[PDB]
Amino acid sequence: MEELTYRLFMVATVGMLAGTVFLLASSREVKPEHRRGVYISALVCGIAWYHYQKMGASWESGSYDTGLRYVDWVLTVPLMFVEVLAVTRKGAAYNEAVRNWGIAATVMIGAGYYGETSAAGSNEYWTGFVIAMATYVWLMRNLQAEGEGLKGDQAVAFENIKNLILVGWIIYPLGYIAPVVGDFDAIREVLYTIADIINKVGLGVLVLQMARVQSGEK
């Protein structure tokens, strides 16, 4: 398990860089007025690239710092919401949602960090899990409500974005509780890494697809 976890960190590091530069190179494929979300998606992957380089070295040392993962999350999750919410809102509606979801994400990630750095299975560990879970469900329920009236290609493209988040983000609570289901400390790290690649590279790809649709592309 330890070597598999190291190899996955090293592969995910290159994967995040690849996501970054692919998204940048792909921005010419959409109209200028729809490139912003592609650039923000690339920024998300680029921040992750920086942190994954650190995480792989941290894991390789044998004294692993999950604070590298959580600081990556606290910066990148609110950014990922920026372009999700831009599809459905602008102006005052957008500002309020971006702020409120960002605050919620910060509470979720902070509660997770509090719990994960507690003794596994302790009351503190479960407190962090339960607070994070409730905030997570609140976020997902807000997300499900966004874009309900959309029709056509833009509705399909936005539902693909929504469903990637609704399904793909389940991996994180599974990873968090993997160490109490078995001798699986490393499996937590495996699951977080797989989740980040799927969710960050995947969301960038779907935001690019959303921008092609908005560009009038088939």
Ligand X SMILES: CCCCCCCC/C=C\CCCCCCCC(=O)O
> Judged by CB under 6 A, does residue 189 bind ligand RET?
no
Dig out the tokens for 34 from the structure: 């729809």
Which window, 76-84, 128-136, 175-183, 210-218, contacts ligand LFA (CB under 6 A)?
A: 76-84
> Judged by CB under 6 A, does residue 164 bind ligand LFA?
yes
> Judged by CB under 6 A, does residue 143 bind ligand RET?
no
- In whole angstroms, what is the distance from residue 128 CA to residue 117 CA? 10
> Judged by CB under 6 A, does residue 49 bind ligand RET?
no
> Judged by CB under 6 A, does residue 191 bind ligand LFA?
no
DSSP designation for 198: I
**Residue 120 class from Cβ within 10 Å (0-12 exposed, 13-18 middle, 19+ buried)?**
middle
Question: In a 3-state reduction of DSSP, which class is residue 37?
Answer: helix
* From ligand X, ligand RET, ligand LFA, none, interface partner of 42 (C-beta below 5 to 8 A by class): ligand X
The residue with its CB nearest to ligand X is: 110
In DSSP notation, 123-152 reads HHHHHHHHHHHHHHHHHHHHHHHTTTT--H
Residue ranges in contact with ligand RET by CB under 6 A: 73, 76-77, 108-109, 112, 129, 132-133, 136, 169, 172-173, 176, 196, 199-200
